[PDB]
């Protein structure tokens, strides 16, 4: 749904900001799957945020316990 996509982008961004990167990637990936020239731009921007959470995850996992 149109609203549901706006809903899940907010959740992805809320989770990313609070450090729940695993949960954020799930909402980022789900929104990207659901996604007119401005609409293509929206997908690029969400795809950028998604890769940024991924890069942060890659760094956090590189912390060896």
């Amino acid at each position: 749904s149109l609203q549901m996509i706006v809903e899940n982008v907010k959740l992805a961004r809320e989770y990313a900001l609070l450090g729940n990167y695993d949960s954020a990637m799930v909402y980022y990936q789900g929104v990207l799957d659901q996604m007119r020239q401005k609409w293509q731009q929206v997908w690029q921007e969400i795809n950028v945020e998604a890769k940024q959470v991924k890069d942060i995850m890659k760094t956090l996992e590189s912390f060896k316990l």
Partner: protein, 146 residues
């Protein structure tokens, strides 16, 4: 609809700038972390003054109590106090998790007594006790009954 897409695009610039900065700050902390020096790694994060990086770091170290040394507690305890007063529930819980690890690992021995490290650690625990007095905070209050 055009408005919903406009809703999405509004928060993008903020997200991009916030995630990039935190990623840079995490790279700095990890470059020290990989030295083996946990303490200076956490001192580095605190010096960066980015609380989101302190929360990410604590979520990591909180998973292995054997990484904690008495020295680390004097750095962490001021952050726990900061986190226990956060608006975000997840920040408060990270603080409770860290404080529990310190109480269960370090409160004995600190009591049994480097003496300055225990002395400093104890006064930090005392101010936190006051904060917890004024759920997670109920349990912590029982844990700090001394």
């Amino acid at each position: 609809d055009e408005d919903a897409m406009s809703q999405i695009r509004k928060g993008h610039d903020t997200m991009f700038v916030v995630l990039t900065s935190r990623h840079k700050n995490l790279d700095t902390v990890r470059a020290v972390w990989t030295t083996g020096d946990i303490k200076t790694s956490v001192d580095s994060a605190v010096a960066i003054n980015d609380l989101s990086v302190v929360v990410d770091l604590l979520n990591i170290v909180n998973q292995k109590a054997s990484l904690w040394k008495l020295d680390l507690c004097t750095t962490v305890l001021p952050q726990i106090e900061k986190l226990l007063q956060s608006k975000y529930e997840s920040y408060v819980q990270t603080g409770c998790t860290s404080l529990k690890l310190i109480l269960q690992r370090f409160l004995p021995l600190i009591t049994d007594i480097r003496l300055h490290k225990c002395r400093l650690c104890f006064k930090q625990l005392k101010s936190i006790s006051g904060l917890v007095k004024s759920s997670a905070f109920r349990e912590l209050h029982l844990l700090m009954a001394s």
